[PDB]
């Protein structure tokens, strides 16, 4: 029989009527709802967020929700109300001790309430990792409301998965005296997620990319050679590759491109093979790849990778580099090598001399071709194609065909091509034989294994030596997680707490194999330009 006060945006009616349904879910008439009273609903059982809602509401602590704080907290909702609310209420989604910081614990406990099995345990962790590193302004290793509405707007932890390092490696680190660059200590930091500063990357990237600006268009290299296909930002990969073909002190490399951007470690294997181009410069060679400019890295996600790690100034520092990627090599006189393939405009190697390579990829010519030409999807097989033809699958350049590859043979005194472009289940490819050599007139390597997690392929290189082109073939290995385009995972599962919380209210409503080469084709597309 005493007045109860309570801070809302309803008016009486509304607040009579949320009354009637507060009753009939009080069955022990107790006037305050228990946790198993909420439970004993049709679709409210299999709702995740039921417990965390509940909680919140909870403003005293009892365990139990009393009228009062049933009418505020969904006075909470429906609010129209200022942003400062809505976001009030999701940082208490994850703020469980109600302290107003987010612990990782917590940050991970909630998330893990949500995404069940969908994740493992280890992944999450790593996921919940990043996220605080990049949100945490103040160095405290917790979330406060100012650095969550940060991100959003645009003991205590569950160990043991490596934590990513806070110390950003100096340039005395990295570089000995000498100038030269210590991979021994570049790898181990980047292998535990580790960054180098903003001025030592920038160096990595310049000191590099000024060797590349002196080398010729068509490179001339020598047996013996561990050739490579695409990388695809799987850091960890690469790793391995250089364990398979030899170490890069003892042993010549040529890379036919594509460093970046279907993975998430891009800058990483750009930081370390320009690294590694200072330290080994007469002996380990990159060329250019389609991805290795300005337009396919606004589309897909390296352009984000080097804002989220480091600086926007670290990726157009790499985009000058890139410029500066030769276009193709001529291998111990036999191999021409090139990222795609041929172009029409290309008949002698004294044409790939003429080309001015130091600018972006125009959206055709022999630049464009050399880079994405495929050959004929039946190729070898061929029944009025001819030799060029309008690429499809990519959207410019063109598809060539074994006549067209064997004029080129023989016109230029050449073996065979070997390039990278397209994945291979078996991670190479071999091409019909030509008439004379009996030898493959073609050969597509490619160095990513288990391509975009997915397609579960297997990754190779050519190693030549001793007149044997021996291909070696290596399965995957493990890298962290991230989630898709580097979000963080408040943005990620704020849309999820967002649909399950109005699911809940709504309660409110009871009175009255490579297969994946199909999935991905779209983005084996040149983009919009
Ligand atoms: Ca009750
Ligand atoms: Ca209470
Ligand atoms: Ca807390
Ligand atoms: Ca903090």
């Known amino acids: 029989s005493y007045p109860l006060e309570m801070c809302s945006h309803f008016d009486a009616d509304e607040i009579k009527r949320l009354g009637k349904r507060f009753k009939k879910l009080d069955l022990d008439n107790s006037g305050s709802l228990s946790v198993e009273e ?181 490179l001339d290299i020598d047996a013996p050679v561990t050739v490579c296909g695409d990388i695809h930002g799987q850091f960890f990969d690469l790793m391995k590759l250089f364990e398979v073909g030899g170490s890069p002190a003892n042993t010549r490399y040529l890379f036919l491109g594509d460093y970046v951007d279907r993975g998430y470690f891009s800058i990483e294997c750009v930081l370390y093979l320009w690294a590694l181009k200072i330290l080994y410069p007469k002996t380990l060679f990159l060329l250019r790849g389609n991805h290795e400019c300005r337009h396919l890295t606004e589309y897909f996600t390296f352009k984000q990778e080097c804002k989220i790690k480091y600086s926007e100034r670290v990726y157009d520092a790499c985009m000058d580099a890139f410029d500066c990627l030769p276009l193709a090599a001529l291998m111990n006189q036999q191999f021409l090598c090139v990222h795609g393939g041929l172009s029409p405009e290309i008949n002698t190697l004294d044409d790939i001399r003429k080309l001015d390579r130091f600018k972006e990829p125009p959206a055709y010519g022999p630049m464009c071709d050399i880079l994405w030409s495929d050959p004929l999807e039946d190729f070898g097989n061929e029944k009025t194609q001819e030799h060029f033809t309008h690429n499809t699958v990519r959207g410019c350049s063109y598809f060539y065909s074994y006549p067209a590859v064997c004029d080129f043979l023989q016109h230029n005194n050449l073996l065979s091509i070997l390039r990278a472009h397209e994945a291979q289940d078996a991670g190479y490819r071999m091409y019909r034989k030509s008439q004379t050599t009996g030898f493959p007139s073609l050969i597509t390597i490619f160095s990513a294994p288990n391509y975009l997690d997915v397609y579960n392929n297997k990754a190779a290189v050519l190693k030549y030596e001793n007149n044997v082109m021996n291909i070696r073939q290596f399965n995957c290995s493990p890298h962290p997680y991230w989630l898709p385009n580097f979000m963080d995972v408040f943005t990620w599962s704020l849309p999820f707490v967002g649909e399950k919380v109005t699911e809940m209210l709504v309660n409110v409503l009871n009175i009255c194999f490579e297969e994946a080469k199909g999935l991905d084709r779209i983005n084996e597309r040149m983009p919009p330009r």
């Open 38 to 218: 909420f439970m004993s609903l049709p679709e409210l059982q299999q709702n995740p967020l039921v417990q965390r809602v509940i909680d919140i509401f909870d403003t005293d602590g009892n365990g139990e929700v009393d009228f009062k704080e049933f009418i505020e907290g969904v006075s909470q909702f429906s609010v129209k109300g200022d942003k400062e609310q809505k976001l009030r209420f999701a940082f208490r989604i994850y703020d469980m001790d109600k302290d107003g910081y987010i612990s990782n614990g917590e940050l991970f406990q909630v998330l893990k309430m949500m995404v069940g099995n969908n994740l493992k345990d280890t992944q999450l962790q790593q996921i919940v990792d990043k996220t605080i590193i990049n949100a945490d302004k103040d160095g405290d290793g917790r979330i406060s409301f100012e650095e969550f509405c940060a991100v959003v707007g645009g003991d205590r932890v569950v160990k043991a998965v490596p934590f990513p390092p806070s110390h950003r490696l100096t340039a005395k680190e990295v570089f000995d005296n000498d100038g030269k660059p210590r991979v021994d200590i570049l790898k181990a930091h980047l292998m535990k997620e580790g960054r180098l500063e903003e001025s030592v990357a920038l160096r990595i990237i310049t000191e590099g990319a000024s060797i590349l600006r002196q080398e010729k268009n068509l």
